[PDB]
Amino acid sequence: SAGPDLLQALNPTQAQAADHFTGPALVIAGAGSGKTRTLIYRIAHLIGHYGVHPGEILAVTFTNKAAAEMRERAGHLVPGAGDLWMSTFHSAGVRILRTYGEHIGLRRGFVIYDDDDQLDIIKEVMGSIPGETQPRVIRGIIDRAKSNLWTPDDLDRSREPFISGLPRDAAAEAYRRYEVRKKGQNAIDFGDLITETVRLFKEVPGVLDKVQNKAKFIHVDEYQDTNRAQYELTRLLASRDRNLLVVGDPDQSIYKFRGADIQNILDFQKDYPDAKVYMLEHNYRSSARVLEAANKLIENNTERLDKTLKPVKEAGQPVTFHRATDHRAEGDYVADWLTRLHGEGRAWSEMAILYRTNAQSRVIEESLRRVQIPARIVGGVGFYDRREIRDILAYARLALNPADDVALRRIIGRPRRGIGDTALQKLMEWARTHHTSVLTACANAAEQNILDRGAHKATEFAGLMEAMSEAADNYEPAAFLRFVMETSGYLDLLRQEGQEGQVRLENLEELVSAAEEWSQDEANVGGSIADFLDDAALLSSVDDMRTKAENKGAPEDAVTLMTLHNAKGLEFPVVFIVGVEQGLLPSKGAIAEGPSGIEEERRLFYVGITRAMERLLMTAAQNRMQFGKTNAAEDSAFLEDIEGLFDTVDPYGQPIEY
Amino acid sequence: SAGPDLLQALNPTQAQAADHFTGPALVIAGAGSGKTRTLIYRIAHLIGHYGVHPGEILAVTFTNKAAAEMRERAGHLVPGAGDLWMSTFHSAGVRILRTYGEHIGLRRGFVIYDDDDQLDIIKEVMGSIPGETQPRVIRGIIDRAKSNLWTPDDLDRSREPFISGLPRDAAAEAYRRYEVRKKGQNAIDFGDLITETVRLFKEVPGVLDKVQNKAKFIHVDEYQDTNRAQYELTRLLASRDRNLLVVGDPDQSIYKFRGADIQNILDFQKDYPDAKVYMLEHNYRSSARVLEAANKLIENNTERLDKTLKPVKEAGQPVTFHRATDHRAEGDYVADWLTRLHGEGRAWSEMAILYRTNAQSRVIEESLRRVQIPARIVGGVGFYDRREIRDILAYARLALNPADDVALRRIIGRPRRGIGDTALQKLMEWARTHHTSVLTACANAAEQNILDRGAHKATEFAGLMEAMSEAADNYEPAAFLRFVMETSGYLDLLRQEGQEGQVRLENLEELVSAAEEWSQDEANVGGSIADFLDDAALLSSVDDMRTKAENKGAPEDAVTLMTLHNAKGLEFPVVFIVGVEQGLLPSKGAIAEGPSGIEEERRLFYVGITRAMERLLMTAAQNRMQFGKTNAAEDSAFLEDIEGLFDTVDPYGQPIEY
DNA sequence: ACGACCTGCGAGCACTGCTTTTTT
DNA sequence: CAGTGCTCGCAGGTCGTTTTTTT
Ligand SMILES: Nc1ncnc2c1ncn2[C@@H]1O[C@H](COP(=O)(O)OP(=O)(O)NP(=O)(O)O)[C@@H](O)[C@H]1O
Ligand SMILES: Nc1ncnc2c1ncn2[C@@H]1O[C@H](COP(=O)(O)OP(=O)(O)NP(=O)(O)O)[C@@H](O)[C@H]1O
Ligand SMILES: [Mg+2]
Ligand SMILES: [Mg+2]
Ligand code: NA
Ligand code: NA
């Protein structure tokens, strides 16, 4: 449509980035400087002005929510936004592998494991190894290796003779045996979503070429929190036409603990020596006051690229800090002030509370509840992570794929029905010699070489299952989930122990209703049940299917509660950062890691601060409760860093020193 | 109504007996001589001629069937038969005790034990005693003692130092402890029906006097097979007005094995020296031929009152014997011959088959079934004795009487439901210290001493029971038995194991239909369900509630199959006596007792023979199978006794001597 | 606080012997 | 046929570890 007018909506530098077009380009700019805004315009300009087809554009965001929100804002500038490919790296790996996984041994209908699934496999494999040792420790090494794009052999030659507390080679062994067992189940994990796609593109160059036709102009936001495997994925993708534009801010890199590699963004002009580089200097988000506090804070980190971050707004309402006697007084001080400011005109949805750890939510929730301030909890106890839901989702996995063993393992027991704690072991070894088909072991229980005591109990389960499978061979997702819930015998259990079980079956109802809202959605026209489970498996804390599911019964236009980490990318007129304490911000872990630990936490704190547009209120306590015990608390060292740049305050409005 | 005409319907001697009136009278006559006929006429004559009120007459028969049949025949002769009191001794014991048992500590709603109930009590009591030994051996000593009218102390002074194989004093102890336990349950047994009534009449002379107004003219049939307890009951009853007429034949005394005392009848005039004695000399039942065989047979017994038994009919068809190679050939020979005679004109219901033991019925049944000759089995597997029935009747006992422990014990685990085997025990001692009520223990399980690990299971049973008790507090027996069968969970068990279970639930349906037919009867107008259980408890082999229930689906006008014992009193134009073998008739038991054993068996055989009116066919085998093995068979010694008086015969018509 | 471990109870399934003398 | 013995399934209890952050 000739595009949106750049120089109308952007400053000249933003506008020249948005006008970039072909070849590698790197956009590097401090917080609140309009990196994401420039991205949105760039996408509309490629289409409007350079006549790029939407179905040739890929934009990779940190969360699907962030991608939905970009897409929409792009539709306001230019037609055809519906056709843009926009998602996380992991969501793209699903889409690529679902389409092309058969070129590298992934049979169609492969299953995507969750963390509980990974432990079934681990416990199963670790027995014979020189590895006491907790299955989850092993799981942590494997995830991290995959983020690093390491094979087991690679891990054998890794730097440290000890990983967590394990011998390097025992760890590699574990990983290696987990790998065989996981492939024997036609299954893959979260990190495989990235590593397998990379393997696909290297092994099958004609496949890379086909995908490059849809990913001809590549955009990647949050490039600072990219890992080696995502790095390598992006390289392969761009390798042909080299239309790669990345955007990020090294001061806001807060995922090293999980694999993020800040050198991806700092080496970009080395890896693409023909890149254009655009640097935004002006923050548009924040009051000049919160900004000065931000800049003086981040100047304490060392080895950082010094970049200009200059204010455009005036120095607004001053920044404040409050130390409460108690975390409970913190509670009340937050809860009280929400009102005052509401009373003065700011809507609930323009205010947020940020905390270092999810444990700190509980007290805050109750403090707003008491005063009935509506609350919206992001990233709390995940709804697709509850036992009830995964149990039903397991029944669903097993129905589509009768050869899925870890699914069986999880629900053969619940409800109880002649579960062979002894018997299952026997069906398990029986299956391996015959071949790993465990569900078939149950059907062949009465007829073949048998397990004596409860042969029939197996058969009945085999028949219960085929009825589900026949009900999945066609017959609708939301109602198929009713089929499973009813006939499995799951509901009548929860009703007969319906005390906390009513709480549990109340959630099972939501599942059907989610499966329903999803079915009746725009993008899911003719969507399979497999498709539903795919989406449910890939949700971020900030995604709709999660926030709605978990805040059901809450109004929108509520106060938002989340971690400092989930705040990445967002912005609010009013921000409360709570628990600014040595031991929390920075965490004890980061303290124990030395300067490089502290520097990560400082970035985290810097993110928190630069979330606020009009007012920032930080608080701390002198005492706080851990799991059952109360200990004295100290201010964060980070407050020392920004002394002189905020006012200390008592429960009421006014001045205190410190 | 002026009565029936005696001299029209009876010979002069019979008529003068039928005309007796006041004071003791003894009628003593051989088989087929019209003792029972005279009794029937005498009853009508007391009413018609002497103006005795029916409600003043008592006639004690050996079975309720025999009493129904007398009553009816009396109704043809005189109005007011409906009001006569006619029954067995044991049935009269129930009526007397139900009315007056509270005068001797029997609280209303006392329960009548069956043989399974007795064993519950036995096993419970014999633990501590110098008694290995089977609970049923003890049970047999107790029953015998009661028939003798012995107390435990009496048994301590009894003749033999060994009873069965027990020391005399351990047996008396057993009996003595059984007694306490049985009374602690407000319960009584079958023999108590006679001994407690006797105790009632001795302890409470005003009660005897009230009953004597209904039993003013007493009649007793089969007086030869009365035991001492019955002997003493009759004496008490007659002690005031002394209008006692007894009828019997010592040649047909066949119950010594159970207590019968032949001296009751032989001493009647020592006991009533002012008695009149009537003796019938003429048999009216039998062909002169079967009669000569009977007489020559009985003449072998010694020390018997030698009385005239002269024929009135002509020497009809000759009596025959057949030896068959097999019991199977016996089967076929009986089966084949039933038809011949059927073909010649005899109806099925004019023919019967008599065997020493109930085991012999199986082969016979099948032989008639093969040739589809309709069969009616008397005294086979008792219908009110099957497990399913006593289970439901136990539920019913418990509903009426929540304090019945034996009932509880039997069904607390039918169906299963936290049948605390260990819990029961813990439930049992709980109740002992607090007090007998075991059902309360189950209700008090959540509360109090806390029978744990399944507390609720007990409570739910206590609740299931109150619902039955509430449903027995009012409502209909036939539909209350539905209530029990449904809600107990009994039916859905038998349906879920409905294989031989369908055979078992088919029977449960008959129960409701019996319960119903009984309700809709003439005498049970406004009948309690307690009343129903009373009647079911007191059936003889020959009684309607039993034969109908056990031959359901069979036509009437069928061939009758029963033991020689159950033939007492009856008559048939055609009689087959099978298995006339040494070891059977006489039994090994009788053989081992010496001449007094042989003499009892000879009486038994004499009864069999004098059942036949027109034709008697006896058979024996050379081989026979017991339970597994097959052994050689030998003719009965009794055939030697009657040689010259029957024809030996081939499977066809005529002679094969031997 | 959370599951991953233990003690003990219920019950189903099999192994094993006189069932058969007669029954109010 | 029943009375008895062996082994298996499942609950109601106990204990130590929880989280640092999460695509
Ligand atoms: N040229 C501009 N004119 C007006 N508002 C702007 C301009 N550039 C950025 N903004 C606003 O500044 C705020 C932050 O922009 P955003 O594009 O979210 O910055 P970012 O660099 O992408 N923020 P962060 O991801 O947290 O480092 C938004 O509310 C934008 O609307
Ligand atoms: N005076 C009679 N006239 C005709 N038939 C008679 C006469 N007396 C007896 N009977 C018949 O003979 C058969 C036997 O009579 P019953 O009154 O049954 O004898 P009982 O002495 O009571 N028999 P039992 O009990 O087996 O020793 C019946 O069929 C009677 O009808
Ligand atoms: Mg941004
Ligand atoms: Mg008679
Ligand atoms: Na595209
Ligand atoms: Na009477």
TrEMBL record, chains A, B:
Domain UvrD-like helicase C-terminal residues, every copy: 288-569
Name this polypeptide is given: DNA 3'-5' helicase
EC number from the UniProt entry: 5.6.2.4
PANTHER family recorded: ATP-DEPENDENT DNA HELICASE SRS2, UVRD / RECB / PCRA DNA HELICASE FAMILY MEMBER
InterPro entries reported in the protein's UniProt record: DExx_box_DNA_helicase_dom_sf, DNA_helicase_UvrD-like_C, DNA_helicase_UvrD/REP, P-loop_NTPase, UvrD-like_ATP-bd
Chain residues that bind Mg(2+) 1: 36
GO molecular function, one term: ATP hydrolysis activity
ATP-binding recorded as keyword: yes
Major enzyme class: isomerase
Pfam families: PcrA_UvrD_tudor (PF21196), UvrD-helicase (PF00580), UvrD_C (PF13361)
Organism: Deinococcus radiodurans (strain ATCC 13939 / DSM 20539 / JCM 16871 / CCUG 27074 / LMG 4051 / NBRC 15346 / NCIMB 9279 / VKM B-1422 / R1)
GO cellular component terms, semicolon-separated: cytosol; DNA helicase complex
Family under the similarity heading: Belongs to the helicase family. UvrD subfamily.
Domain UvrD-like helicase ATP-binding: 8-287
Residue sites binding Mg(2+) 2 per the record: 36, 221-222
